[PDB]
Amino acid sequence: MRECISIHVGQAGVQIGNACWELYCLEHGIQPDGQMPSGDDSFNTFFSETGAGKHVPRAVFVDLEPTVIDEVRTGTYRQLFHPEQLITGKEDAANNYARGHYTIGKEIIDLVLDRIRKLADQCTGLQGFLVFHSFGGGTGSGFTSLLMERLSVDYGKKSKLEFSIYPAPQVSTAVVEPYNSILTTHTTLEHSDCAFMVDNEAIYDICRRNLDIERPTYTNLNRLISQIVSSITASLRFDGALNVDLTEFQTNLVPYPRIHFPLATYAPVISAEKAHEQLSVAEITNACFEPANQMVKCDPRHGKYMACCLLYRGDVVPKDVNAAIATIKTKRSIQFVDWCPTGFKVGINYQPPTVVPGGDLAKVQRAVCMLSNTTAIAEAWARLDHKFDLMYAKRAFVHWYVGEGMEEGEFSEAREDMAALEKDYEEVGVDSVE
Amino acid sequence: MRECISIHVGQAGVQIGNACWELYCLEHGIQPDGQMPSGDDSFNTFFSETGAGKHVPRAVFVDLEPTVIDEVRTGTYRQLFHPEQLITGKEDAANNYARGHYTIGKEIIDLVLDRIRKLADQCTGLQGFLVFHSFGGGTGSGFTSLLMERLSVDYGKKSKLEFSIYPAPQVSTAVVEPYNSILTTHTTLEHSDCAFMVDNEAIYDICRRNLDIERPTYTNLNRLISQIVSSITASLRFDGALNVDLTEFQTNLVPYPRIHFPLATYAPVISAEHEQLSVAEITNACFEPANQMVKCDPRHGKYMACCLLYRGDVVPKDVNAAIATIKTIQFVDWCPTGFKVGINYQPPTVVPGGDLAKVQRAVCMLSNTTAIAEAWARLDHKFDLMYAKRAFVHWYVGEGMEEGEFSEAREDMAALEKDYEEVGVDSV
Amino acid sequence: MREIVHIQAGQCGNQIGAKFWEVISDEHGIDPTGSYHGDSDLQLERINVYYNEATGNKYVPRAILVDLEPGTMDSVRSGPFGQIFRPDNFVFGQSGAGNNWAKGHYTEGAELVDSVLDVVRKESESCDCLQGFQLTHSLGGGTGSGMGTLLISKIREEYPDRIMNTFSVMPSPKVSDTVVEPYNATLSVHQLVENTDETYCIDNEALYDICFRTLKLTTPTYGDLNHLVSATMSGVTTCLRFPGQLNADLRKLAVNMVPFPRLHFFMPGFAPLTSRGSRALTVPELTQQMFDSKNMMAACDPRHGRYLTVAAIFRGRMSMKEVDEQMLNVQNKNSSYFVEWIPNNVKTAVCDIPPRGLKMSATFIGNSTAIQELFKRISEQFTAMFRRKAFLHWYTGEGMDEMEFTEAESNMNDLVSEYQQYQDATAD
Amino acid sequence: MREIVHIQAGQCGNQIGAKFWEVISDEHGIDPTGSYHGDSDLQLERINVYYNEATGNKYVPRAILVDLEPGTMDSVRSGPFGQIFRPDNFVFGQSGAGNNWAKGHYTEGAELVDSVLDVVRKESESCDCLQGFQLTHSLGGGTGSGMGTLLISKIREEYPDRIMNTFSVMPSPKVSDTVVEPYNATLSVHQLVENTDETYCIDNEALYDICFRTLKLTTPTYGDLNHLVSATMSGVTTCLRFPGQLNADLRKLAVNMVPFPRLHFFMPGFAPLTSRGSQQALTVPELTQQMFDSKNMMAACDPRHGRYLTVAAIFRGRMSMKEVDEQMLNVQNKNSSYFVEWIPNNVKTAVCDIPPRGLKMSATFIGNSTAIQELFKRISEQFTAMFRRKAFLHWYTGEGMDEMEFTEAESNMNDLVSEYQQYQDATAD
Amino acid sequence: ADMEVIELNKATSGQSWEVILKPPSFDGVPDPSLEEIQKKLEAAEERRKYQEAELLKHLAEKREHEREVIQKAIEENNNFIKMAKEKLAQKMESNKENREAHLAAMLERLQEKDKHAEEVRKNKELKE
Ligand SMILES: Nc1nc2c(ncn2[C@@H]2O[C@H](COP(=O)(O)OP(=O)(O)OP(=O)(O)O)[C@@H](O)[C@H]2O)c(=O)[nH]1
Ligand SMILES: Nc1nc2c(ncn2[C@@H]2O[C@H](COP(=O)(O)OP(=O)(O)OP(=O)(O)O)[C@@H](O)[C@H]2O)c(=O)[nH]1
Ligand SMILES: Nc1nc2c(ncn2[C@@H]2O[C@H](COP(=O)(O)OP(=O)(O)O)[C@@H](O)[C@H]2O)c(=O)[nH]1
Ligand SMILES: Nc1nc2c(ncn2[C@@H]2O[C@H](COP(=O)(O)OP(=O)(O)O)[C@@H](O)[C@H]2O)c(=O)[nH]1
Ligand SMILES: C=C1Cc2cc(OC)c(OC)c(OC)c2-c2ccc(OC)c(=O)cc21
Ligand SMILES: C=C1Cc2cc(OC)c(OC)c(OC)c2-c2ccc(OC)c(=O)cc21
Ligand SMILES: [Mg+2]
Ligand SMILES: [Mg+2]
């Protein structure tokens, strides 16, 4: 009952998946071989069980090239996954959305759907899918949107949530990433119910500033991302004081189907080397409204909130949370839209954040992840749309997409949808009449 | 030996019945088991006899809910009654006349009539019925009027007397009692030959003022009511001379059929916790409002009849001297200014552990006065306040009663108030 | 009218419902195992109204525990008196309602409802004379609001002749769980106006304000709010659970409290107001406090409207004379706050048994026109969201039409204008 | 995208091609017999991109050696790593091309082309996942230019879904073999503009100038010029040959470097510039400055005369990634007017731990600059100076060519130049 | 003095009489069937039965609406699936047409070159 299927697409999706499932194993006491030396039954939402007591992730890893998934196949957690869950092609999408969605993607889409069907047919109450991918890759953008479209046909309105990596120049970008980003966003928009964007620049800055890492690696970035993903999914994997199921998340975060991009803020992010009193519920909650700890670079202080979901974990009691929220409710500087009488949803889980050995994060007694639907997230769209417009005005690189069977009309159609999305975020923030 | 059948309806009727039959037993020397250790044969009007010498009340107890009658079934006097004469349903009328008359009443009416028929078959000369009930309850109002209608069909002309409890805010009333009172009064009017209303406020005040009871209980109220009921019925249970049969109540007190509501005044009411009162003293007390059963002012109305029922140590010479001083109180011009007086040699018996003191002599005056119309006026006003807004009427209509029955019942009450007015004006 | 069947739905319903059973079990001398260990026979006299008698003289609550999420069912089972409940009476789903009225009423709740009706039917058929149902639930979530109102309509269809009584928790932004509370509440009020006979409006806005302002609790928890609810629930049902004064049932209460069918939403009140870890209190103080706006469990100022009807219940050893004098004083001094066209519209009951912790208490049940302020508050919040169609896709996604929202809002606005109508209605 | 098939055509193509295999074989630890005698596992990690594995754990270059003259391929076979090549992969004619594009493209080359395609087909079919082709040739001669472009068009027809990459040597009168090189080059550029995905422009004018002016060699030989070519070829393919942060293939490079299909001619650059008698430490700032200097360009164009559409810099040796990042950012911020503003993040940097032979630090530059129009204008000026007089035209018409084919090739090269000018002038505005 | 006492009766348990103080001022002259009762009771029963029937008809309509809501939720889901299937099929067919056309045009250009190369070889023979 209440199962969740995770789908990891492309390099970014796969590598972030490695960090998430490593963390989940550590949180639930599952060994790399799937054995669980042994209570709380809730972890079965993410793990199925074999007759020989092996706990297997309800996950599928897909990439159009084999080298990233090959590291999973030979790595520490090679025994955790059944070979059929790890799917690879021979040639990647070459950072081209059209190859991921059409030319190369079409060759492996049916096989991926078959493996997802096999996992779905082991569920007695599937809650939905969690899809991990980059915006910039040819596979992360193209294959994901193709998969998302096919999942809507095979599973109707079954919830599909995304964890999308938003491109940053500091963290290994490619020239055509803004194109892939707008194309995937346009094609996935009606198929996704909620998407958590993770700006690589924000994660990079948090690693540099809060963890003292001079030049962060993907391992540094992904371990931090996994901590935030774990906070979002902990509500499904544990039985806490106040629980939040998948449908409850969306009902309380998404006011309109297109307006489904919450901003994630996590606290505390403390260095392992940092030698130091423990932060209170009020302190960590206040930190959720400071820009330094955001997952996307934007300014909520100059936008309007539509919803706020606070996901606490560790040593936390409702009384302290309510007192912290009461002080936030009397902060003139945090403005909600006039059509939202009560914008909070709270979740509390007993299990404190887990430290991966050899990791950069310090062990904390309590942590919180705020998911807020703010009009400020449209700044991130605006930055990507501008980069798209600079190149598209000259039709630079478009021949690579047209050569794969795409039409120029699809570029302008995707861009017009982004313009409407920016306009939707503007309209949603305006005051109501009379 | 002309028999009388008592019918006790609803909580008030049943609980008052318990007090009356306890008192009758004490007056006739009948034990709780029905045995009578032992002449005057007259007690057989109210009690039949079995082959094993047991004396059983000619009474039927009916309620739409079992808890009140269940206390009779397990109480001190459980052996006095045969199970068949104690009839109960499963759910009460919920203070709704329409629920008791139309919905629930319909389910048990034939069973009640069968049990009354069984008692009537044991009679060689049935006089009629004495019906005890509240005006305010759903059973007391609703079931009683249904029963009275059926009794007129099955026993045409046989006298039917009522002892009705008139509602008072100081003695556990409900908001809709004025509706129930006017609805039952309207339907029962043509079927009743004589009705003795007992205002709960009057009884409550007598208990507080004369018996020093700070907050009277139904036990306190009912024991006092039973003393007055006993005074009225003593004439039928002993070899007397006045009110010797039920027909005589109508003859002596009710000259006009609709104007059949006498005012009862009783004296003396002395706390069990003082020299004995003379015939003149107790007779004078009959004309003091403090001792009436219904709150109203006879001093500002006109009398149509006056019956003085004396019990105990009383000789005609002292009664006549007392009446001579009373002459030195207005009657209607068509009636003679006078009194029908009855003496019963048995003094009032009081219940041990009761609040009333033992007296040598007592008197109950039964007067037909136009002042009793004040009681109707108070009830009609409360009815009008609620009915103008149709407050609570949906509860009655939901039970199948028509809204037109409310106005039809109220029009009959308006005519009754007008009849009391016309009866007091001079003749031509 | 003997047995009541209790149903508790959703998180709020089961949390306040469990507290209710803990409190009244303590009052009736029932321990968590179901064994009677009290000393007074008054505790067992009417224990059949809420408890079934089982093997070994055990008392089992006639309670049905419902939820679309298994979590709360587990927390009740592990709670203090969790072992007292009948294990077969726990009816729970696996996929919650996601704080969505449409999911509880039309989708997930509709899949579970027949299983609940089977357990209701089993309980009801073992009743000698079922009087009705009592549901505890919130209106702000999805299961208690959506599925709870679906259960009410299904129960009405199967038992159209039985009373449906609810303890309905109204949402407030001061203590909120979900953004969509105004939608869920308006859709539920629409159901309650048509399908319930009596509803106790338990406002979280009022409960929070009492905890914050009166009790001086800087941060009130649900435990603090639920302490006020349990005290109110214990008081409001005293007349049903304890003998003496009047054989009280749900229908008699409804007929005396509800003058117009849709106006059946009661403003509960309690005195004294205490903390979880909290004197003497006099009759004049109890009476004054019980009528004070600060003691009301619905966030309405009674001085902004008029009382159609009032039920006041005093608990503890106290002077009945003093209670009567103080109640009369209140009505005479505050006459403009009582409708003049419903005579004797304030009824008082006194129970010897006080609640736990207090030697004296007083529960208030008012049918006030000021309750329109509660509905106007929900309505303002509803339209602020509905004008922008905010979150609407979560309801239309379940098959609902936008028209169904328009209808529910219209019916709630009609209910408000009906209260205003009787607030302006004067005697003529 | 794993295997690359290498083709070398003509004298120049086979000479620079042999040098390429000698240099990368040493980098990968491959000896002239084909045996691995290195120490690092990083050398073998991506060996399959250029080498086939054979009996006895031998590594054989996936190279096809083509020429219409038997001479150069005999010298290759006797050369240092001549024994490493697959003997069946030597495809040669007996009658050369006489530095005549028409002979290589239409006559002698057309007779030999199917034999070459047979050996290309054999190599390609033994690839797990062929990414594309890499051709080394000159544009001034007749076989590498004429037959090389014929091979490209035939390969495109059979493998339209693969990448075609060339290392094309541009002619210069400073080191010329014949007077007709402008004709051969223009006819070839016409072919490359339509049929290649990426072309590295190795300009003999630039190579001669670096040898004469910078390296102070009074008389540069082809061996001196080829030393600069081999260093550039080694650098430009480092990302293909070694494991790194960048999982590099030919298609990903093309999609990020080529904004408009015809503008696929790269200006390679290298630092430090050294003689064949190599010797002694250039810092990261010095490497960064030198690699963007006009004197370090392998095409005779001043980059400061145009703008960069896209740039790829590849640093080799043990060095600070922080320092590389800071210096590269500094260059872009200080020289912002030389980078097109309408292509965000158009400069990509990669760092490889393995330095080339002789150097402890090096930097290879790959620029898609609009300044490359100077190279095409130079060939065009020389072309029209001859063509206006119809000089030596009977050499081509004698093979069946028409004067009109010359007119079309010249027109297409003039169009190429105006297209570069168009994007040089383009503004984001 | 202005009183007339007139004895009425006498028995073992009491005595009675009448006392007239003054004569009257004005000395002059001043059945529902069982069927009809049954008719009233039966008319009320039919009115109660009618109102309960009307309530159950209202509730029957509610159940019908509840069925229509579930059906509508299923139909909207099915229409979403249908439209997504059609849009995707159209999109992937539009890409197949485009990819096929682009490749066909590319090969046609190269085939034209083959025709030209045959003409150049023919032209060489013509010159000899
Ligand atoms: N946070 C994070 N970002 C990553 C990671 N790997 C790649 N990215 C980012 O994702 C973008 C590149 O997309 P990739 O996921 O590598 O591409 P892909 O899905 O494999 O698609 P192909 O082009 O077919 O290889 C750049 O913005 C990278 O910085 C990773 O492990 N973590
Ligand atoms: N004097 C007196 N009045 C009583 C007694 N019991 C009830 N009443 C009065 O009767 C009225 C209420 O009617 P009940 O007799 O209890 O009603 P019921 O006939 O049982 O009918 P339902 O319960 O509605 O079905 C109020 O005016 C009470 O004060 C009693 O024993 N003595
Ligand atoms: N007073 C009170 N209200 C509660 C409690 N728990 C939840 N609520 C309220 O109930 C509403 C949420 O509905 P809930 O019953 O938890 O959800 P359901 O399970 O879907 O019925 C909100 O108005 C909450 O503030 C509780 O224990 N006490
Ligand atoms: N850099 C370089 N250029 C060469 C070499 N050999 C010839 N060239 C140039 O190549 C052109 C002549 O082409 P060539 O390869 O000799 O003719 P082909 O054998 O018919 O292809 C002229 O521009 C020469 O300057 C060489 O080994 N290196
Ligand atoms: C994703 C690639 C692929 C690639 C592949 C490479 O080798 C195949 C290579 O080395 C020359 C490259 O330059 C470092 C690159 C490369 C080059 C340039 C880029 O923008 C101008 C870019 O953003 C990204 C890439
Ligand atoms: C006869 C009842 C029935 C009843 C029943 C009760 O309990 C079920 C109760 O307590 C809540 C009540 O309030 C004291 C009552 C109750 C309440 C109010 C009344 O007028 C407004 C009234 O007249 C009489 C009644
Ligand atoms: Mg990749
Ligand atoms: Mg009763």
Short mmCIF file of C-alpha atoms and ligand atoms in Angstrom, two decimals, chain B residues 95 173-177 392, chain C residues 131 198 200 235-240 246-257 308-313 342 344-350 365, ligand 6:
data_model
loop_
_atom_site.label_atom_id
_atom_site.label_comp_id
_atom_site.label_asym_id
_atom_site.label_seq_id
_atom_site.Cartn_x
_atom_site.Cartn_y
_atom_site.Cartn_z
CA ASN B 95 -43.66 16.19 23.97
CA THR B 173 -42.38 22.52 31.64
CA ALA B 174 -41.21 22.23 27.94
CA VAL B 175 -41.43 24.99 25.27
CA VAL B 176 -44.27 23.35 23.23
CA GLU B 177 -46.62 22.58 26.16
CA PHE B 392 -42.12 24.39 16.29
CA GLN C 131 -32.92 6.76 19.60
CA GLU C 198 -29.07 19.00 15.97
CA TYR C 200 -23.12 21.40 18.21
CA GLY C 235 -21.95 18.52 29.96
CA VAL C 236 -24.18 18.56 26.87
CA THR C 237 -24.91 14.78 27.26
CA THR C 238 -25.38 14.76 31.09
CA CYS C 239 -29.15 14.68 30.74
CA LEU C 240 -28.99 11.62 28.46
CA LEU C 246 -36.34 14.43 33.26
CA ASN C 247 -36.01 11.21 31.15
CA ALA C 248 -34.05 13.08 28.46
CA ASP C 249 -33.67 11.81 24.90
CA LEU C 250 -32.44 13.29 21.60
CA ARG C 251 -35.92 13.88 20.14
CA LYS C 252 -37.34 15.72 23.16
CA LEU C 253 -34.24 17.97 23.13
CA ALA C 254 -34.67 18.66 19.37
CA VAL C 255 -38.38 19.47 19.67
CA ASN C 256 -37.71 21.97 22.50
CA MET C 257 -34.56 23.52 20.97
CA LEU C 308 -34.47 31.42 20.20
CA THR C 309 -34.00 28.70 22.91
CA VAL C 310 -31.51 27.92 25.68
CA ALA C 311 -30.72 24.81 27.70
CA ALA C 312 -28.57 25.36 30.81
CA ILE C 313 -27.33 22.38 32.84
CA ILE C 342 -41.13 31.84 22.36
CA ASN C 344 -40.26 30.15 28.68
CA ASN C 345 -37.46 29.55 26.17
CA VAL C 346 -34.70 29.06 28.77
CA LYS C 347 -34.73 25.64 30.45
CA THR C 348 -32.55 24.60 33.37
CA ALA C 349 -31.51 21.15 34.57
CA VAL C 350 -29.50 20.28 37.69
CA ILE C 365 -26.59 25.15 24.89
C1 LIG F 6 -37.71 18.51 27.80
C2 LIG F 6 -36.51 18.87 27.33
C3 LIG F 6 -35.53 17.84 26.83
C4 LIG F 6 -34.08 18.16 27.09
C5 LIG F 6 -33.15 17.13 27.07
C6 LIG F 6 -31.83 17.36 27.42
O1 LIG F 6 -30.82 16.44 27.27
C7 LIG F 6 -30.95 15.49 26.22
C8 LIG F 6 -31.43 18.62 27.86
O2 LIG F 6 -30.13 18.84 28.25
C9 LIG F 6 -29.21 19.09 27.19
C10 LIG F 6 -32.35 19.66 27.90
O3 LIG F 6 -31.96 20.86 28.46
C11 LIG F 6 -32.04 20.92 29.89
C12 LIG F 6 -33.67 19.46 27.44
C13 LIG F 6 -34.61 20.54 27.10
C14 LIG F 6 -34.10 21.73 26.67
C15 LIG F 6 -34.72 22.98 26.44
C16 LIG F 6 -36.00 23.39 26.67
O4 LIG F 6 -36.45 24.62 26.32
C17 LIG F 6 -35.57 25.51 25.59
C18 LIG F 6 -37.09 22.61 27.30
O5 LIG F 6 -38.17 23.18 27.56
C19 LIG F 6 -36.96 21.22 27.69
C20 LIG F 6 -36.04 20.27 27.33
#
